[PDB]
């Protein structure tokens, strides 16, 4: 009978395990996503400073 | 900043060179006035030469 409770707990814990593995893996994946997004910022900076540099010219 | 400094450096060169040519231009105008004065002096000496009484 107690194996019933133990089974249900182990199954809920498997669910927790996969959910929390995704939670952790999100850090690893979004680090790369940020490594990508840096391009947006740097290119925008370059274009802006190009505009004001043209003004100076 | 380096590109802006390129533009500023060109501005400095251009202003400096223009001012220098302006300086020489004024000085050459002064030399030209002096040359005019000396040519006038030469003509006046010729006029004196025309007059024998002083020329003698």
Question: How is this structure best described in words?
Answer:
- The structure is cut from a larger assembly and holds chains A (57 residues) and B (56 residues).
- With 57 residues, chain A is mostly helical.
- Chain A contains one helix and no strands.
- Chain B has two helices and no strands.
- Chain B has helices at 2-50, 52-55.
- Chain A binds chain B through residues 53, 56-57, and chain B through 3-4, 7.
- Chain A: This is V-type proton ATPase subunit G.
- Chain A: Residues 33-53 have a biased composition (Basic and acidic residues).
- Chain A: Belongs to the V-ATPase G subunit family.
- Chain A: It is found in: Endomembrane system.
Summarize the helices and strands and which ones pair or pack.
The structure is cut from a larger assembly and holds chains A (57 residues) and B (56 residues).
Chain A: H1 2-56
Chain B: H1 2-50, H2 52-55
Subcellular location (chain B): Apical cell membrane; Cytoplasmic vesicle, Secretory vesicle, Synaptic vesicle membrane; Cytoplasmic vesicle, Clathrin-coated vesicle membrane
Protein name (chain B): V-type proton ATPase subunit E 1
Family (chain B): Belongs to the V-ATPase E subunit family.
* Beta-strand content estimate of chain B: under 5%
Sketch the major β-sheet of chain A.
Answer: none
- The separation of the N and C termini of chain A measures 84 Å
* Number of DSSP E strands of chain A: 0
What distance separates the N and C termini of chain B? 78 Å
Largest sheet of chain B: none
Question: Total number of helical segments of chain A?
Answer: 1
Query: Which radius of gyration of chain A do the C-alpha atoms yield?
Result: 25 Å
Please, what is the oligomeric state? part of a larger assembly
| N-to-C order of helices and strands of chain A | H
Number of H- or I-type helical stretches of chain B:
2
Category by helix and strand content of chain B: mainly alpha
Order of helices and strands of chain B: HH
**Helical residue percent of chain A?**
over 70%
Gross geometry of chain A = rod-shaped
Please tell me how large the radius of gyration of chain B is: 24 Å
Class per helix and strand makeup of chain A: mainly alpha
Strand content of chain A: under 5%
Q: Most extensive chain contact? A: A-B, 3 and 3 residues
Helical fraction of chain B equals over 70%
Protein name (chain B): V-type proton ATPase subunit E 1
Subcellular location (chain B): Apical cell membrane; Cytoplasmic vesicle, Secretory vesicle, Synaptic vesicle membrane; Cytoplasmic vesicle, Clathrin-coated vesicle membrane
Family (chain B): Belongs to the V-ATPase E subunit family.
Family (chain A): Belongs to the V-ATPase G subunit family.
